[PDB]
Amino acid sequence: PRIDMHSHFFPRISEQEAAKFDANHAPWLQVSAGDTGSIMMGKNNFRPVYQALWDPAFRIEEMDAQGVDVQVTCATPVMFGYTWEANKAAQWAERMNDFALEFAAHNPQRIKVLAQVPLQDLDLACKEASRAVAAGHLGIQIGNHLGDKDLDDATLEAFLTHCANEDIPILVHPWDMMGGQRMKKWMLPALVAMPAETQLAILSLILSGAFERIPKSLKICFGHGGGSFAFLLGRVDNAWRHRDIVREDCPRPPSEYVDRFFVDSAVFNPGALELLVSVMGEDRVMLGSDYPFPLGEQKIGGLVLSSNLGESAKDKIISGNASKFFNIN
Amino acid sequence: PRIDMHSHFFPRISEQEAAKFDANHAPWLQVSAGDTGSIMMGKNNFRPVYQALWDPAFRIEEMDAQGVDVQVTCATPVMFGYTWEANKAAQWAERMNDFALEFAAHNPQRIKVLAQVPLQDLDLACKEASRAVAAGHLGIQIGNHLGDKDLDDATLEAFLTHCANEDIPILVHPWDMMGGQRMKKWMLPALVAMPAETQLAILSLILSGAFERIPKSLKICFGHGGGSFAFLLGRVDNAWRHRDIVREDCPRPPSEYVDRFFVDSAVFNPGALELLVSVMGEDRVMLGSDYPFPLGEQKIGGLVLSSNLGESAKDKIISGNASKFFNIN
Ligand SMILES: [Zn+2]
Ligand SMILES: [Zn+2]
């Protein structure tokens, strides 16, 4: 069996549907050619997309071709709405999470969905998380930060702890990338800022001592192999050993906390995957493709399948780990 | 023989010396206890430092203890002065580069120095680079960016090309880190922003096509193992294969340009070093410690010496590569 736990969808939202929330910032889908289409914002074009992003039937055909039995899918991060007024964002989140379940309803045995939450208000976010999971979502996908609040911020740690106590799994996705006016060309935000964003989120939890407070029951996974986290961990441990301000809130070597989280396998390179599995363990890396975006893996699972990891490790990564992490059969 | 090509010094600058340039932004050294001291700016304390940073005699004692035969050293990046008026910055650069040669004069067989340049004015920077090297410097150390100008910017590429045509080697050091108002605690700028800064500098050259224009004669090295560059290269190659805007200026797979630059070995982890050498080749990684700072390597060369790389590879990394790169015996 083969599970892909990192992929995205975008629902068939009309311009008028979106305008009832926000004419300028609520995204919607314009479908033409329906082979091609575009995530729209207001009247401006936001991003060109193709049919698998919005069409569960077409998607199942590609999944069959790729040999993917079960795909876990979740919002495109442009849908997050973290800057909106909280109550409007919560209404948006519930509408998007209902759309997701409608997408999955096409074939709920093979399409699983994770939900978004109005993270700018802890109470509303906790309530939508429980509501979405009760309605059929297998967990939540959040952005890695909320403006200048990183995951060490008590509000975000409290959302994680809520999910832990309710056995709700979390996928953390980089979004709203740092960088200012730099990285204008060649998709540098996706190549530089995204992996740094995810590393920052992981280190924000470790170095703030959040894992000393969050129950071990938390199931939390970081996208894109955890960014650069695994490769730069030796530098973190060395800093921790030599500067008291790095130890202030983190009572043991930072690298020891890798038993508290998961990463997907999307590192697009054999040696990077081997290092990732070295650092994280064969039990904490899960096949994820970033389907259907261009910077995802074209042959889903190809990197893991063609690796020199043992047959046992390949089975956990392509199926066993996500089956346990998301409660899939 | 053993060469450490990444280390820093700070000269015995008095408050009045610095005030003749800028009472508020020119750094200086306050030496007390002389065991301890502090890089000062204006009347405010900037960073606590210890004696090896400013004392060549004391430094030689530690080098003897560590088994370091030759150390290459260069400005502490707070000395760069890239925001200053250009002519004042050029006068500062020449004074700092003279101090560096005075530091090295204590034992020029075992202490080599690289120079700083007033990078905010290409003509003055090119002139100081040639002048410093003529006076005895073995190359130049620059910051990785100049404000919102990264290394793809024609002015910085032109400085690199000048050095290439004059056989002047370059060390590129992360500095003035991205991140805005985030990363306030646990030295996250050094752990997250610095490796991303260096990755951004390397990718700025590759993805802009600068290596198609800069002569192959350029000898250029990136600090801290090149940041996260080597681990995230598979993600870059995949993006390049699937988005035309990533290929616009870079006519072949980005990973093929690793034969155009060097990195130091300071990745503080055995598996990271093995991956680094895999990506870069045993001929393009050089032992560097970041001495004498806390986030440097305590036992200089310990990671390389205790590795499972071949005896031949260990010899290139700890001695042969830098001997050739800097023209040392
Ligand atoms: Zn994604
Ligand atoms: Zn340094």
Residue numbers in the entry:
A (entry chain A), B (entry chain A): 4 to 36, 38 to 333
Paper text:
ACMSD, the enzyme responsible for decarboxylating α-amino-β-carboxymuconate-ε-semialdehyde (ACMS) to produce α-aminomuconate-ε-semialdehyde (2-AMS), plays a crucial role in controlling QUIN levels. This zinc-dependent metalloprotein is situated within the tryptophan-kynurenine pathway, where it competes with a spontaneous chemical reaction that converts ACMS directly to QUIN. With the cavity of ACMSD, a mononuclear Zn2+ ion coordinates with His9, His11, His177, Asp294, and a water molecule (residue numbering based on ACMSD from Pseudomonas fluorescens, pfACMSD). ACMSD functions as a dimer, with residue Arg239∗ from the adjacent subunit being crucial for the decarboxylation reaction.
Trp194, located approximately 5 Å away from the Zn ion, possesses a bulky side chain in the active site of the ligand-free structure, suggesting its potential participation in the ACMS decarboxylation. Here, we replaced Trp194 with alanine to examine its role in catalysis. The crystal structure of W194A was determined at the resolution of 2.02 Å. W194A maintains the overall structure of ACMSD, with an RMSD value of 0.265 Å on 265 Cα. Comparative analysis revealed that mutants H228A and W194A exhibit a significant decrease in kcat values for ACMS decarboxylation by 142-fold and 26-fold, respectively, relative to wild-type ACMSD, indicating the essential roles of His228 and Trp194 in ACMS decarboxylation. The 1.9-fold increase in KM value for W194A suggests a minimal role in substrate binding, potentially shielding the active site from the solvent. Interestingly, mutating His228 to Tyr abolishes the tautomerization activity, while H228A and W194A mutants exhibit comparable kcat and KM values to wild-type ACMSD. These findings indicate that His228 and Trp194 are not involved in catalyzing OAA tautomerization. Subsequently, a nearby base deprotonates the C3 carbon, while an acid protonates the carbonyl oxygen of the keto form of OAA, resulting in the production of its enol form as the product. Despite the structural proximity of Trp194 and His228 to the active site, they are unlikely to be the base, as demonstrated by the comparable tautomerization activity of H228A and W194A mutants compared to the wild-type ACMSD.
